[PDB]
Amino acid sequence: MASMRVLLAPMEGVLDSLVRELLTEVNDYDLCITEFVRVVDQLLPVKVFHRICPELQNASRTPSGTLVRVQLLGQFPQWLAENAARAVELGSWGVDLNCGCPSKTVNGSGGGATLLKDPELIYQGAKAMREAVPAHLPVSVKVRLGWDSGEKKFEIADAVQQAGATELVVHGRTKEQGYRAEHIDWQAIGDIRQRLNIPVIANGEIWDWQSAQQCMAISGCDAVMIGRGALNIPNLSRVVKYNEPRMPWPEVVALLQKYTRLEKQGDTGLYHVARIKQWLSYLRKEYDEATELFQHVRVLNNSPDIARAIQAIDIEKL
Ligand SMILES: Cc1cc2nc3c(=O)[nH]c(=O)nc-3n(C[C@H](O)[C@H](O)[C@H](O)COP(=O)(O)O)c2cc1C
Known part of the structure; x- marks a missing residue:
């Protein structure tokens, strides 16, 4: 009967520091990821990082003690790297890169899901971040399986491993599949995991103890990320890890x-x-x-x- 990691997903416009404080104190989340910092062509001021992630001043933890990681969104490797470095200087426990979310392209810099059209961009982004974060702290990346199909799903995965990322979160849908329940492909998460040598964290449609059991049995992941479910059921980490009602x-x-x-x-x-x-x-x-x-x-x-x-x-x- 196995060890298991549950991460609290980042949710722009829904989860802030206060909700993270409340949820973590009644859960066993192993890690929360913050809503993203939008990186274009500039080093963002220290105020922006502190106000998005107040936890940086408490050794990167919520008040009840759960680790928190800063997320970045953007394309330009120079600037991801410099913002990654700042998040870490300010105390973020590693740093995450968002390649999952639909995002406007501002000033020629895309970000999030739009990187899935050209995995080379993910390689270059993640690799610059890995080079700028001290080698012992982690650099994670969150992906979908592709833009409007899963054909590039292994290329996306390789790009992340080959850049030297520490771990990969797979939202098991394409961008155009959105949040439609009928399209979640936990099996593809597994096919990805088998090919890799870094931990794969399964994400999408994990609502309760049984769904999580099903997801892990199919994907082979011993780690999952819960988003919307963490709001539907406030103690969902405990439901999932221990079968708490x-x-x-x-x-x-x-x-x-x-x-x-x-x-x-x-x-x-x-x-x-x-x-x-x-x-x-x-x-x-x-x-x-x-x-x-x-x-x-x-x-x-x-x-x-x-x-x-x-x-x-x-x-x-x-
Ligand atoms: C309103 C909303 C905001 C989100 N914001 C983010 C975000 O800031 N960064 C990110 O990587 N994912 C974001 N996501 C995606 C989630 O992290 C997660 O991958 C997705 O909800 C699938 O998980 P689920 O089925 O457990 O909810 C967001 C999802 C929703 C619905």
């Missing part, structure tokens, strides 16, 4: 109350409401109780009204 509704309400108490405390803004609405939108998929709450919360505009709504729910009488 899903967090019961009264404990998730307690968690959201805490969200709103830290919301105000951190001074995160008078109209900082999107992530709390989004979280509830995800929680409808697993908890019938969250549909009523989401309705009452979605029509609200500001963080104070939303807090009173949520921290007025009596956890006992429930």
Whole structure:
């Protein structure tokens, strides 16, 4: 009965430092990846890295102690390398490169999924980052299987290994397959793993204990990355590693109350409401109780009204 790694996926516009703080304290995530820093042709200021990844000031860990890694998105090897170096100087435990997400091409620099059309770009990006990060810290890369087909999936994988990356996360879909459940190919993740000599972390459609078991049995990976599921089920790392039942509704309400108490405390803004609405939108998929709450919360505009709504729910009488 085997060791296993579970990583918390990066999620631009959904997961920030505060949500990472809350989730990690009720989970056993081995690592969270931050939402990406967009790299074009410039070294980004220290403020940008600290505000995206406050954990850099706590030895690259959430307050409960979970490691966090800074992600980059961009194409130009010079600048990835220089931003990679800055993330590490500031204390990031290694650095990740995003080759999975659809992304605008700004100033001739593409990024994310658009690199999947030309694996040589991934090789050059990742290799410059590997050369600029001290050799003992890791450099990871996240990929999809290709742009509009999986034909280049092994070329993408090789590019990452040959650049000297430490590990590879495979979102087992193409870019054009988006998030459609019917297209996840965990078997291709496995075919990739077999060919490589670095750890492959399986990603996509991992919702619960059984799905994770199924995914690992097919891919052969002893590591997985959970994204949307980590919001659907707040203790999903424990569900997946130990077959814990899903967090019961009264404990998730307690968690959201805490969200709103830290919301105000951190001074995160008078109209900082999107992530709390989004979280509830995800929680409808697993908890019938969250549909009523989401309705009452979605029509609200500001963080104070939303807090009173949520921290007025009596956890006992429930
Ligand atoms: C709203 C949203 C934002 C995302 N932002 C990022 C991101 O910043 N960087 C990244 O590498 N992946 C990002 N992803 C992709 C996830 O990391 C993950 O690969 C994807 O959701 C598949 O995992 P799942 O089926 O567990 O959710 C995002 C996904 C969603 C839905």
